[PDB]
Design an enzyme around this catalytic site. Structure first.
Site, PDB file in Angstrom:
ATOM      1  CG  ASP B 292      -0.769  -1.196   2.140  1.00  0.00           C
ATOM      2  OD1 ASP B 292       0.276  -1.258   2.830  1.00  0.00           O
ATOM      3  OD2 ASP B 292      -1.655  -2.080   2.188  1.00  0.00           O
ATOM      4  CG  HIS B 389      -2.464   6.674   7.094  1.00  0.00           C
ATOM      5  ND1 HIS B 389      -2.150   5.393   6.692  1.00  0.00           N
ATOM      6  CD2 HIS B 389      -1.287   7.337   7.198  1.00  0.00           C
ATOM      7  CE1 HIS B 389      -0.840   5.286   6.559  1.00  0.00           C
ATOM      8  NE2 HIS B 389      -0.294   6.452   6.860  1.00  0.00           N
ATOM      9  CG  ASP B 391      -8.927   4.519   4.882  1.00  0.00           C
ATOM     10  OD1 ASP B 391      -8.511   3.744   3.997  1.00  0.00           O
ATOM     11  OD2 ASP B 391     -10.105   4.474   5.292  1.00  0.00           O
ATOM     12  CB  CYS B 545      -4.620  -4.547   6.005  1.00  0.00           C
ATOM     13  SG  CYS B 545      -6.191  -3.797   5.468  1.00  0.00           S
TER      14      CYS B 545
END
Lengths: 563, 563
Positions: B292, B389, B391, B545
């Site tokens: 990521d 982050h 997110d 993840c």
């Protein structure tokens, strides 16, 4: 306006701050029990709500607005009564504390401190900053700077639980510098640190800061610098500080502006012959003796305008031969197909297309002039001239009728016609200046072709200037002038370049073209006057040229333009 | 249109070229004798004039327009008869040669080659260039490039006296590259040379060039690249070449565009557990296994759109932890107080104000995203989270009713209420996960204050997103979620951060919050579904993840926006 959302509960009471001028929304259902509710609160709180209703719909809008700074913490209350079916439930308690926090500057370009973004025009908003220009504290050195004031009205004990911080973004810190006025003045924001804590007392108070810019706009700086004020909550000693309210002012750094010959001359400078001192004299202008490597412009702010010199109480900038300021001019104010250019339009020459032998003004200069947006630069064609300056083929003189000025373009044509009309009259034997006769010049096929080629280059600029400056033939005046291709087929003047004149207001200092003498009076010298005098210009011819002319800044405020 | 001014004389005849599409003005008085004149010329020349008049006023406007490319040099004539008092004087002769010179590209964003400036919108004009993206000739490698065509229609012997040159400004040469199609393809314009001579034959002809961009827009590149064509006269072997006519096309380099979760997923990628492969499966999406640290976006041109990866047939860019692409998101299309954001609005977090301990995304990234203008970046507040982050506190999921999506914000409140409603019901003994009971969590004063502080940070972003994205509470959904201040009072998830979900279209892959089990069914897991399912989302919980999601580019063409 803009603001926050408070959450009240039947659980316990909520304490909160509300800055005057912001929108305080209220969340009632979040921790509610019971189907309807009622809102009642202190006199200083105007509780307005829409779909003062009674339902319990999370679509109901309950906004509070305080009417004034509280005297102590929690002066205003807001009681939320939750009732329903066959019950009389809880009453949610909310203690608000209103405070006044205005970080304000001269957003109305008026020299006096009174939509979160900077906007151009006469109906626009935004304070203005001058760049600091100095080559190598109190009002004795702070009138050139911009005043920014932080006024506060809060309860005495208010700053025991909240602290104000003034900041600039890290990306703009190296471009601004803020001074704090202690009623000495010390630096609080700058290239060094982006943020700073204010030591502000409770109650009514207000401190002054003084701001200055350290960089004109450029390819990497649009010109906006933002200063924000943050109100942080530090009531919990454990948790970190929590921003409660932010507000800011957006400054715009004044561009460097060039001044056209149509502006009244204020002062002429010359370097170590005296036809110029007699000229300034008639020209109602000052004169001081000490090099044409610099250009005197100006920066301007509501509170102060200030002359600034540009080289490679005077400011300075040094961004860095088509590459010299002698290839830099400015049209007078002009309108083109609607778009208005009040400060003129900068003119600088170079070549039609890039080659192994094309010259051009250094890219760092071009990019700089464009960055000042106010005089949207126009590229002309001058690379054809041995030296390469646009002043060798053009000039602007003040007019009293049409647009207020006249474009003078050199013109080989206007000279052949003049020498021809001269021959016909029987003077084909007149001597110019080796010394050639007006007929050998006329019969010279080679000289003729050369000028014919120059006519092409100048004519190409005639159309360029016509388009970009929105000129009409009636705005142009051809000055008789000959040329000769010497160095690498590059052009030079075949006799003193007359269009390279010192326009000192209404009085012109033109290079003397010792041309064919008729009636004891040079025909060129004579022709030039029959073109300029009927406009009011006072033609005076000198012999050769180091001079600069500081001129009067446009009454029009650059920030009223609409780039 | 735009053009030149020809000077005719009784002396000798004038030869001149006229490019079809330009305005050719005529100067008649310049070398005139006699008081009036008359204009008569070939059929192919439409001599229109205003104050066809007869006077000799230099205010008369005589313009010529050719109707078509000549067959040979001087096919059209224009005779100027100068007559007056009691005389029949000279007739000025003018031999014109009409030619067609169109440097044209796809100025109508339609994939097909058909006002001298680039303009946005559906009613705008301007070809588009994709940047060349490649990590380490014919159509086999030229469909990604932009086609530009030069068509000419001139007399056979025309290019014996004139030569065409194609050029770019030196300031833009290092940003473009032009290939010439020989009907192989060789480089003609580029970082190396700014100009180039075209070997073009007389008569009807047209060559193809292929253009590509070598740089996305950035703080030092607005994104426009201009290619001009010059028609030079080289009829005199002595004098240098004289530009006769120039025309150009203005290209704009396609921005790098980010893709929101509301877009249909096209492909998911994962790195060296398989709940995701079952998910993509239900999600009607492909799946391929290999980090990521990159973000899959796309560049788009009328003739081709192409996926482009962004890290620090796939393109690449590498501009260069709030400083990672994990702190990079995009709102779905949204409208704010009128202004329309069709491609969404990029969201990335940092801190409220700059400090000794403030983190932020590297300035070179921020400046880059802004340079692509199309998704006007918005700064949120995330510096409060240990990792940092955005997110970690937000997410966007596809909706079927309102604006077409829903903003999910983490919410400590929604979890206390849920655990409380749970206690009241008699389950205050339920175990979360050391393993704490739902009542110790509720009675924990210290945990409570922490979340209360997080509520503040998230709530501050709630209002930020509300303002910049023009959202309404009805567009937001609070997902129950707890936090804990650990490292330097920074925040971490008190249990699997559910709002950090893999939105794969309509199928969500949410982190499993092994929370208080009631009726053999985690209350959180249960609550999340009662908030999402009624919207159509298929909630599936996984355990942790590394994943990325290439998504479908907006049907809306970025250049139809109006930044």
């Amino acid at each position: 306006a803009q603001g926050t959302l408070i959450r009240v509960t039947p659980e316990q009471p909520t304490h909160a701050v509300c800055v005057l001028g912001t929108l305080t929304q209220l969340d009632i259902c979040s921790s509610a029990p019971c189907t309807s509710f009622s809102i009642n609160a202190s006199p200083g709180v105007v509780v307005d709500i829409a779909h003062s209703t009674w339902p319990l719909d999370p679509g109901v809008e309950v906004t509070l607005t305080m009417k004034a700074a509280s005297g102590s913490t929690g002066d205003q209350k807001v009681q939320i009564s939750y009732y329903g079916p066959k019950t009389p439930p809880v009453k949610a308690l909310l203690y608000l504390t209103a405070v006044e926090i205005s970080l304000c500057a001269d957003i109305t370009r008026t020299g006096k401190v009174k939509q979160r973004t900077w906007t151009w025009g006469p109906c626009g908003q935004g304070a203005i900053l001058l760049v600091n220009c100095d080559r190598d504290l109190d009002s004795e050195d702070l009138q050139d700077m911009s005043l920014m004031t932080l006024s506060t009205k809060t309860p005495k004990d208010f700053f025991t639980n909240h602290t104000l911080v003034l900041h600039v973004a890290r990306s703009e810190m190296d471009k601004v510098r803020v001074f704090q006025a202690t009623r000495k003045c010390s630096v609080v924001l700058g290239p060094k640190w982006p943020s700073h804590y204010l030591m502000v007392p409770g109650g009514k108070h207000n401190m002054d800061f003084y701001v200055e810019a350290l960089a004109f706009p450029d390819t990497d700086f649009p010109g906006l610098i933002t200063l924000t004020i943050s109100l942080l909550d530090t009531s919990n000693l454990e948790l970190p500080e929590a921003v409660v309210f932010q507000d800011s002012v957006v400054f715009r750094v004044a561009p460097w502006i060039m001044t056209p010959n149509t502006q009244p001359p204020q002062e002429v400078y010359a370097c170590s012959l005296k036809s110029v001192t007699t000229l300034a004299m008639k020209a109602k202008c000052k004169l001081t003796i000490c090099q044409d490597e610099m250009e005197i412009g100006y920066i301007q702010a509501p509170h102060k305008t200030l002359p600034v010199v540009f080289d490679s109480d005077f400011g300075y900038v040094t961004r860095g031969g088509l590459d010299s300021f002698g290839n830099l001019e400015v049209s007078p104010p002009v309108t083109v197909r609607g778009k208005e250019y009040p400060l003129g339009r900068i003119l600088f020459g170079d070549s039609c297309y890039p080659s192994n032998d094309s010259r051009q003004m250094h890219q760092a200069l071009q990019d700089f002039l464009s960055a000042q947006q106010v005089q949207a630069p126009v590229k002309l064609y001058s690379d054809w001239l041995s030296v390469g300056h646009v002043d060798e083929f053009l000039s602007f003189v003040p007019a009293p009728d049409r647009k207020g000025f006249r474009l003078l373009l050199a013109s080989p044509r206007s000279c052949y016609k003049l020498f021809q009309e001269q021959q016909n009259e029987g003077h084909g034997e007149a001597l110019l200046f080796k010394q050639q006769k007006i007929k050998n010049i006329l019969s010279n096929k080679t000289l003729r072709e050369h000028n014919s080629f120059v006519e092409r280059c100048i004519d190409w600029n005639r159309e360029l200037l016509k388009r970009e400056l929105g000129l009409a033939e009636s705005d142009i005046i051809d000055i008789p002038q000959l040329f000769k291709l010497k160095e690498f087929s590059k052009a030079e003047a075949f006799f003193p370049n007359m269009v390279n004149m010192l326009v000192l207001g209404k009085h012109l200092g033109i290079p003397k073209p010792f041309g064919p003498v008729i009636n004891g009076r040079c025909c060129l010298e004579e022709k030039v006057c029959s073109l300029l005098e009927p406009l009011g210009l006072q033609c005076t011819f000198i012999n050769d040229c180091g001079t600069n002319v500081r001129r009067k800044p446009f009454s029009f405020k650059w920030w009223n333009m609409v780039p």
